[PDB]
Design a protein around this ligand. Sequence first.
Ligand SMILES: CC(C)c1cnn2c(NCc3ccccc3)cc(N[C@@H](CO)[C@H](O)CO)nc12
Length: 289
Amino acid sequence: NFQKVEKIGEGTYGVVYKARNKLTGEVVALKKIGVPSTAIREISLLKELNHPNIVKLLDVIHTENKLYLVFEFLHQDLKKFMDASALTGIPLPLIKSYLFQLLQGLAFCHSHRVLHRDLKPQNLLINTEGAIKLADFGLARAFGVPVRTYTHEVVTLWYRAPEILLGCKYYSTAVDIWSLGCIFAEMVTRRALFPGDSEIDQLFRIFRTLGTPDEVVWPGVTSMPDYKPSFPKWARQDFSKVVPPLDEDGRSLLSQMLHYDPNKRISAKAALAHPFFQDVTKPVPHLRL
Ligand SMILES: CC(C)c1cnn2c(NCc3ccccc3)cc(N[C@@H](CO)[C@H](O)CO)nc12
């Protein structure tokens, strides 16, 4: 039903193509992943979870022991945009608008009790209208998040919340707040905040910046499955050192998004109310297509 126009990239679950609907001219992104019917039932329910900051899921097609997901197509991703902005950075009003829009996307999904679980710049997609959109929402619950992609590329740990790294089995909406916080910091500084290259390196990078967590800041932490008394005990650093030249409001929100305790970490809804968004607007990015 579709002719491929070009390879878009390799996703966690399979290859993604820009394609034109061979009869209707419609340009879409087709993601190609026999599948368990649990994964079919779950994915199908996502066709209803529509929001302007969630990439629209157009169709799910189960055929020939393969699964195709047909999505609306966006022309750029946030990872590419950040690399393209390396030399001068993303201007603050655009960072602010993108953070605000993503939190609206989270507030929506969270309200329907759906989490993403694997937010990263690769799956935040942007258009010429100044919009940014969450892709892959809901796919982690459907297939798990594995250690490597189907092409054996490493699944990044850089945005993983510490409760997940600490072996927690039942994680909450707060894991998406943690990742988005990490992505916010990386847009501001132009460098990944916690670029771990193993689970313990990712944990220790977290502890080196935010302090080794203990029962004072996180009740129950010492009881988590992968917690070890023998973790080195690092002191917390100042956010003023971590994401200069972010302003006091943005530092305050960041600090709330990166609370160790997922019960104390700010909600997407609360975050939309933060003073940081007092003067939020919607600029246009410059994109070369
Ligand atoms: C499939 C749909 C969400 C979807 C819709 N657009 N799109 C883009 N657009 C940006 C782009 C990048 C290169 C060439 C042309 C456009 C990248 C992408 N990336 C995949 C793979 O890199 C990621 O898995 C997030 O879905 N997935 C998608």
